[PDB]
Amino acid sequence: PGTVDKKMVEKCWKLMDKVVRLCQNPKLALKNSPPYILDLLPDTYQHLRTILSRYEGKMETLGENEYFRVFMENLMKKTKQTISLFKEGKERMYEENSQPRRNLTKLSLIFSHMLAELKGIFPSGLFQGDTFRITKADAAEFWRKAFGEKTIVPWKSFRQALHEVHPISSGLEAMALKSTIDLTCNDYISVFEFDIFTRLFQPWSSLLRNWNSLAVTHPGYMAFLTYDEVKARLQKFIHKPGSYIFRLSCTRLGQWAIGYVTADGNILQTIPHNKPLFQALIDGFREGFYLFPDGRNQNPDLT
Template sequence: MQRVLMAAGISEDVVSQRPSNRQHRLVNKTLRRLEKLHEACADPRLGLKSSSPYLLELLPETASALRRVWEPYRGLGAFTGPAPGEDEAVFLGLHARTLLAQTDRALLLFKEAKEKMFDETSSYRKDLTKLSLLFSHMLWELKAIFPGDRYHGNTYNLTKTEARDFWKMTFGNKCLVRWSIFAEKLRCVHPFQEGLESVALKATLDLTCNDHVSVFEFDIFTRLFQPWGSLLRNWTQLAVTHPGYMAFLTYDQALSRLGRHPRKPGSYIFRLSCTRMGQWAIGHVTSEGDIVQTILENTPLYLALLQGHSQGRYLYPDGQDANPDLSALHRPDHKAKVKVTQEQYELYGKVGSSFRLCKICTQEEKDTRIEPCGHLVCRRCLDSWLQKSAGHTCPYCRCDVEDTEPVEVEPYQPKHKQEKESDTDDDHEDIELVVKQMASLRKKAPERKTAQQ
């Protein structure tokens, strides 16, 4: 246990393998502070709006989730339940301490602000809003690592294929890694500089502000700044230098900010969605002066901004005339490569088809991979399907579409058979459909033979 804690950068006094009375007191103390903060936020003079993240709902939900997650390890007045696994224990201890620290920060704001807290324009009120976003991130993370109130951090399935491979090969089944260790490993595949660039990257990745990166936080980051091949380049152009990016903004604040530009249609900003982690929310001023905010479903942000610009929606980032050119991020060489295996080549040859062509329209080449199932289609067919279907599901297997990624299918070259390789992340085609086509061809063959006779 000592070795695991040291590797994660956590000392023995933070958490032990079996929760001790110290952790018992820590959790109870955190629950009391959350209740105290809820009482402060319930002051009618504060006038909190019920749009997400709404502290009067968020704080009780956080306390309830905390109780449920710790319940299996608690007895009457002491921890007497089963000992959690090592990684689970590390996460539980760090989460509880971080939650207590952020709750104390919020209570200190009320103490220092006094009457200024009731002024929506005060710096204290803005800091409280930022903390509400942090509380929301922590709750989302807890739910993701403990779905159904049971630990699944060791089996968490990252949405993006390349990100999943990187985490598994580098950190195995760990759900939490200290930032310094994570940064060292990430730098091997996506170089970045020490100093300001590293600090900015940490601020974007470490959503819960505890000097660690969880598998959940890494999943969110890679979904936001896809595709993997240009991950940090995308992050730099979209979150570091882009004037339209707003790091800590709620729905109401976005409305207020865009309200500064009623006579400049096409003004826009984008931010992390408060209700759908891993998705972008884009707001813009319409030609009528209205403000519309939409959440991207399955389109990379840079592509949505390029498309919106061509349609006259996203013209002026935060009302500024200079709109960054993101076309470089749309180059084909940023697409993930999908290699066709010999088996796939031969199978499709038997049915008179091509692996590269979309199976829905049989005309366009496959250029989009659906996550998490991995099926390949052309973008046009997928967009048409998603518009017509009741829910956002894969047209093949009907699983929920959590994300999409642009890909390029590399044709199979028969002369290189000796270079054949097995790639489990190639197209997970719906084999059942292919088998049905082959069966249909076999059935028709005897009929044609009989007709010829």
């Protein structure tokens, strides 16, 4: 990706302004629940202003930084895709479950992940990638050994390095692994995305067996799903107490969110920060709460 200068950033801001104006169309009636594009693009704008202010008089330093070059290219691309969604979608955008509205929700989730990453790498607007603290010690040691203090690596280099410790099946498993870890959908793995993935699928010692058991062969796992989409999806099981699904929390990145149908026909969502996901699912099954993953009668045996 090319060098970033102030003129590229301001062009991106103009495109972002066009998106937030399109999204305020009263016929659209977007709900305010996270991930909310009308929160996320303004917050992204404000954080980018903070970054540019920290680099006043040294914009060349910022604009040559590899992570920032990739980030700005991706933000521009994804903002243009959102505009194209409105121009191709026209009145279909006003229908809640239309293809363009589902695409807008997926993009909203991607913008949320991008913002979180940007703040993890530039917490007060200054680049802090070289001292980024990976949460799990065994995962931190992997990154230090393979990549030093690097903040971002291409997917193919990341795959090759990870395969040395946790072998990866070629084909669709490798594709599914990439889709899980590449939260910002940019074909790179940042140290932030690595931190999130290794928190979600801890312990490191069995990382990809955990991921396979919780995300590939578990029908309860939902990729790129929001809180409101979980409520919608479980509505058809409101008559089947114990139906449940789980996904990444979008506002507490690195935490899981489990949605379930209660005995009195409510849909609740909970974040099991007290214990690992494996254990939350095991305990919830034994206690009668997490019985029917995505409404199915058979539940995986995580023992």
